[PDB]
């Protein structure tokens, strides 16, 4: 195939230069499990029990007993397939554009296939990372004009039925008020049996700079970060607490455990960008290629993620 198709050979020789996605830092090794599905859905069943009323006293003769009810729940995860197209220069037309230190028509913004492919792949991977963390797909910095997505497609920041805390605008710079809300959220967290697990914290850079200041008359050898780690270590059975900073977030604090049982990521085996076999060709030197990628696969238990939003006026 490599002999017959140049583009296949070019991609294989350039695929190693594409950097790994940053989302991998947000999940434990066991939390990610690939699935074989391009588009469609997958379903799972969970079973719950509940007590209808107070227990019945077994005295003398009695016929009416209190009952224990059961309920079924079906969870469906949706998958979607999306594609992008980019223009580039025909392989046989490269020799007529090679220059002293570059290849491609600068005046017309045309590139060789290899460099075009690498740049497009990086941009798509940036788009994927945004979706996983924030649950939305958009190219505007304002976040509007979002692509309409299928239900049962959520990210870590838009997952429903989670603990949500809001810091008042007037206390935007008061670290004590911010830490107060975090504790209130931490108390409402419901880990239950899966508590002896590592925890993960993701903050915006503005939040991180506030954290590194010493704890407050100021204390010695004790930072706001150290106090927070101790507070989380209280409820996770003294397990490791990791802190990461992401420029994607803005005035948002995300706390969630790193246990596969509570939160699991089941992405498609074709989520990461992949070249298409169809290549548009013409009499000119300009060709087109297509890249495919798959979105979706995030599953989490309810009331297991804390989302703190610091309102900015």
């Amino acid at each position: 195939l490599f002999d017959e198709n140049y583009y296949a050979k070019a991609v294989a020789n350039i695929i190693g230069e594409v950097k790994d996605p940053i989302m991998y830092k947000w999940f434990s090794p066991d939390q990610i499990e690939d699935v074989d599905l391009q588009m469609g859905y997958q379903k799972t069943v969970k079973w719950d029990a509940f007590l209808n009323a107070n227990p019945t006293t077994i005295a003398n003769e009695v016929n009416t007993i209190s009952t224990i009810g059961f309920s079924s729940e079906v969870v469906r995860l949706n998958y979607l397939k999306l594609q992008y197209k980019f223009r580039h220069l025909k392989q046989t037309s490269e020799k007529f554009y090679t220059s002293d230190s570059y290849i491609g028509d600068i005046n017309n913004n045309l590139l060789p296939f290899a460099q075009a492919y690498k740049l497009a792949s990086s941009e798509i991977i940036k788009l994927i990372n945004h979706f996983v963390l924030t649950g939305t797909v958009s190219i505007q910095k304002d976040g509007k004009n979002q692509k309409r997505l299928l239900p049962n497609m959520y990210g870590l920041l838009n997952m429903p039925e989670q603990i949500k805390e809001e810091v008042a605008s007037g206390d935007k710079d008061k670290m004590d008020k911010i830490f107060e809300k975090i504790e209130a959220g931490l108390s409402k967290l419901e880990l239950g049996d899966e508590f002896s697990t590592p925890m993960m914290v993701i903050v915006d850079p503005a939040t991180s700079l506030k954290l590194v200041k010493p704890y407050a008359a100021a204390s010695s050898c004790e930072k706001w970060e150290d106090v927070l780690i101790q507070t989380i270590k209280a409820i996770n059975n003294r397990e490791d607490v990791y802190i990461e900073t992401s420029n994607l977030l803005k005035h948002k604090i995300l706390i969630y455990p790193l246990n596969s049982e509570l939160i699991k990521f089941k992405p498609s085996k074709y989520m990461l960008p992949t070249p298409n076999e169809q290549v548009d060709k013409d009499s000119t030197d300009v060709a087109h290629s297509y890249i495919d990628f798959v979105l979706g696969g995030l599953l989490a238990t309810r009331k297991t993620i804390l989302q703190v939003n610091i309102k900015q006026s």
């Binding site: 294989a12 695929i15 790994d20 150290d226 490791d240 085996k269 076999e277």
Partner: protein, 40 residues
């Protein structure tokens, strides 16, 4: 069946795509093995 294998020879496009999927999987496996998070 991965692009990281120099001996690999894709016969058709479908095998080529499968090698890409395997190659991505091996890279994320390698990433976690090499990852060492900073405690405290």
């Amino acid at each position: 069946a991965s692009l990281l294998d120099s001996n690999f020879v894709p016969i058709n496009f479908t095998e080529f795509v499968q090698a890409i999927s395997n190659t991505y999987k091996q890279r994320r496996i390698q990433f976690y093995e090499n990852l060492k998070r900073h405690k405290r």
